[PDB]
């Protein structure tokens, strides 16, 4: 195939970059035509690239001045593979001026994607282009704000005034039709030099190789961006091209020269195979020097695990700094920190293990710490692992960083003698870091569900007055990995004891909860800042349990006339390990007032169902105290259940349409006198039986000699709850169905009914009992002659 591969590119501000497409046949990527401001129609009526045939990704046209008809630019563009769809679009047309007609009749098919054509004040032939024949995905088009011999698919499809939209036969779906309209090769598409010939194909349906069109890439020629075939060496070279240039470090995965190894797969030093590696083993990110100034300064640093450079962080400012960072384990260069104001500690570097420091900060300092105010802790060197390959240590102007911390990096990083004198400024660092930390030991602990009582050793500096007071640092410890540090650390002051241990207790605690506790002291440092403090190691306490909470959302449904299924939620407050559930249920009596209501009347409706300013005063008192001393002295039951490992339940063996009371409780204890929560109450009624209200039983009538009939029938003694009344329909030969109501009292005292003075003839008897579920069944006709 004669031409160059034409990587995707864009042209701006003039026609000068247009000349670079002269020797182009197939675009491998995407072209963008835009910013043609200093451009005229004449400068482009005399320019074309007939050699150009294929474009891989898309084309972009936006704000181009001068171009009048695009048939001139691209007389031989046939297929846009749509491999990369710009804004999920295979073609974008926006803000077009000087342009009148489309002119690209040579485009017949698009593999995938859609086209957006917007802001075309002077576009023509808007309704004369067949989109469905070209676009396999037509509903995503956005064609708005526009000026709006050959077959009609009925409007004729024409691109220009002279040549129209070529309509290959539908049999040539993707083969392409030749000049006379014959299906070309399957690898051919649109048009072909010779019909049915991969060697003479203008276009390659799936892949290209050696002037010929193939569907797949055979080895050693690997798939190349889903459009052509290449062996390993050239793909290596471009991969190695990225090695010694700015890039797309190429890799071959699935025998495809994709720029990127897929997830969990990693580069091999020998071959380009993206070998497996659990979660992408590493993530080195090149720079070699970049400062970190804010959150966004670490945007590309997300997921980086190794830095082939050095970092100079200066954050002139919470946990957001941890999520960005801490993914990194090794850094080839040095680390420099300076005046990061709001940096209390460097905890958020979780993964920091090794530092090459081969590139050395001036003074050969693999580390540089300066103007660090709030920096109180580097890392828990008792557990964290860190080592420096080489370099020196700079630690200056860090008034709130204890020297003991400094004493730990050389013993952790193996830099014991690498430094020299003044590498650490003994006086600029930890001036306000009081870390004498006289170990403090708790004397006694008493615990409860809410009130825990402490007691600790009473400690004394050489002057008892020096002690300002105690304060207890406490906060719930879900885990065991808790260190002091903008920080919550709930803490309460304690006045020094009068001179037994001081001790203290707390309130408002949550039973069955772990807490982390440590204690420090307050002493006014001497004239030489010899604070000589005392500190308690952090301790963890877990309070006991209590009565739990009610299980939540107790919901029960009558899935059957005998099945009652319950659902609920675990209690909001387990307050200890919940051993099981307490369930209590009971048949509920219905209302007895319905047993006296006579429903034959109106009422037929049926109810169904700061500090230092204090330190002045302390010093003030002793000073006055001391002065006089020098002056004065002269040296001459219910059905229940235990639901275990379940949040639902079913109760069966229940009568239909029966009211119930349901009681649910939670207990965090089973054998030894359970601590149980209070109950959750829901009322349950099953569905009624479908045969319980039907009047079952022979109907007996007694005609009296004076034309009186007495009604005797058997009601269904087990009704749906109960039967409100009996509806009776009696009809005589030639008459209509009269209606009769038999109340509960009417069937009680009359054992049926008493009908008197009936017209002579033969009647019918139909009685239906209405239970709470509703009407039952009408009785069978008891015809009687009067």
């Amino acid at each position: 195939y004669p031409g160059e591969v034409c990587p995707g590119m864009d042209i701006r501000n003039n026609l000068t970059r247009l000349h670079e497409l002269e020797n182009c046949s197939v675009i491998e990527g995407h072209l963008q035509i835009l910013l043609m401001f200093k451009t005229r129609p004449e400068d482009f009526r005399d320019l074309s690239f007939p050699k150009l045939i294929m474009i891989t990704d898309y084309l972009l046209l936006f704000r181009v001045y001068g171009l009048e008809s695009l048939k001139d630019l691209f007389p031989n563009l046939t297929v846009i593979r749509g491999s990369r769809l710009f804004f999920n679009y295979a073609l974008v047309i926006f803000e077009m001026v000087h342009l009148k007609e489309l002119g690209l009749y040579n485009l017949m098919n698009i593999t995938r994607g859609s086209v957006r054509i917007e802001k075309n004040n002077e576009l023509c032939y808007l309704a004369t282009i067949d989109w469905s024949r070209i676009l396999d995905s037509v509903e995503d088009n956005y064609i708005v704000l526009n000026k709006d011999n050959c077959p009609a698919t009925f409007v004729e499809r024409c691109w220009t005034h002279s040549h129209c939209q070529k309509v290959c036969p539908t049999i040539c779906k993707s083969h392409g039709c030749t000049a006379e309209g014959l299906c070309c090769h399957k690898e051919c598409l649109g048009n072909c030099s010779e019909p049915d010939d991969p060697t003479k194909c203008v276009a390659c349906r799936n892949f290209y190789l050696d002037g010929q069109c193939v569907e797949t890439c055979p080895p050693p020629y690997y798939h190349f961006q889903d459009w052509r075939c290449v062996n390993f060496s050239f793909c290596q070279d471009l991969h190695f091209k990225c090695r010694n240039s700015r890039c797309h470090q190429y890799v071959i995965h699935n025998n495809k020269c994709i720029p990127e190894c897929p997830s969990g797969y990693t580069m091999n030093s020998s071959n380009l195979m993206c070998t497996p590696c659990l979660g992408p083993c590493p993530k080195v990110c090149q720079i070699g020097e970049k400062t970190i100034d804010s959150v966004t300064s670490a945007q590309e640093l997300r997921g980086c695990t190794v830095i082939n450079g050095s970092l100079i962080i200066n954050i002139r400012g919470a946990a957001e700094l941890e999520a960005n960072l801490g993914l990194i384990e090794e850094i080839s260069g040095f680390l420099k920190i300076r005046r990061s104001y709001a940096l209390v500690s460097l905890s958020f570097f979780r993964k920091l293990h090794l530092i090459r420091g081969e590139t050395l900060e001036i003074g050969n300092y693999s580390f540089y710490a300066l103007d660090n105010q709030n920096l109180r802790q580097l890392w828990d060197w008792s557990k964290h692992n860190l080592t420096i390959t080489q370099g020196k240590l700079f630690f200056h102007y860090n008034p709130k960083l204890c020297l003991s911390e400094i004493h730990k990096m050389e013993e952790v990083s193996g830099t014991k003698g690498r430094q020299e004198r003044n590498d650490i400024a003994l006086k600029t660092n930890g001036d306000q870091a009081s870390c004498e930390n006289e170990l403090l030991k708790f004397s006694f602990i008493r615990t409860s569900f809410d009130k825990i009582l402490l007691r600790w050793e009473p400690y004394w500096p050489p002057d008892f007055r020096d002690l300002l007071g105690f304060m207890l640092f406490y906060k719930e410890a879900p885990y065991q990995n808790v260190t002091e540090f903008s920080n919550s650390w709930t803490v309460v002051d304690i006045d020094p004891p009068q001179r037994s241990h001081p001790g203290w207790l707390m309130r408002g605690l949550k039973p069955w909860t772990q807490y982390a506790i440590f204690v420090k002291t307050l002493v006014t440092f001497s004239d030489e800042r010899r604070t000589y403090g005392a500190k308690s190691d952090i301790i963890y306490v877990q309070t006991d349990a209590t009565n739990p909470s009610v299980p939540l959302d107790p919901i029960s449904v009558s899935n059957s006339s005998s099945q009652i299924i319950l659902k609920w939620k675990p209690p909001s407050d387990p307050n200890g390990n919940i051993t099981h559930y307490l369930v209590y249920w009971e048949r509920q009596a219905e209302d007895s007032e319905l047993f006296e209501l006579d429903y034959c009347l109106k009422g037929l409706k049926l109810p169904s169902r700061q500090i230092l300013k204090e330190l002045e005063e302390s010093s003030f008192r002793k000073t006055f105290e001391d002065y006089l001393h020098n002056v004065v002295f002269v040296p001459r039951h219910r059905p229940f259940e235990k639901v275990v490992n379940k949040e639902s339940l079913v109760i069966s063996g229940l009568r239909h349409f029966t009211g119930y009371r349901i009681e649910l409780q939670a207990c965090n204890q089973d054998s030894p006198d359970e601590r149980c929560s209070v109950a959750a109450y829901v009322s349950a009624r099953t569905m009624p039986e479908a045969k319980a209200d039907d009047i079952v039983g022979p109907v007996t009538h007694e005609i009296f000699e004076n034309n009186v009939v007495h009604l005797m029938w058997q009601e269904p003694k087990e009704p749906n709850g109960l039967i409100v009344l009996y509806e009776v329909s009696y009809r005589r030969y030639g008459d209509e169905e009269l209606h009769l109501c038999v109340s509960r009292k009417h069937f009680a005292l009359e054992r049926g009914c008493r009908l008197r003075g009936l017209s002579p003839g033969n009647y019918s008897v139909r009685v239906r009992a209405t239970s709470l579920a509703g009407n039952g069944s009408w009785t069978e006709p008891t015809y009687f002659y009067v």
């Binding site: 050489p462 002057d463 007055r465 105290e625 001391d626 001393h629 004065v632 002269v634």
Partner: peptide, 27 residues
Amino acid sequence: VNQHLCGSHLVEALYRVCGERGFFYTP
């Protein structure tokens, strides 16, 4: 017992040492 006595503890220490004689002062 040798200790950094100062404050009321110092004073009570002094009264432990003396008080049978009185603490010296310039006449």
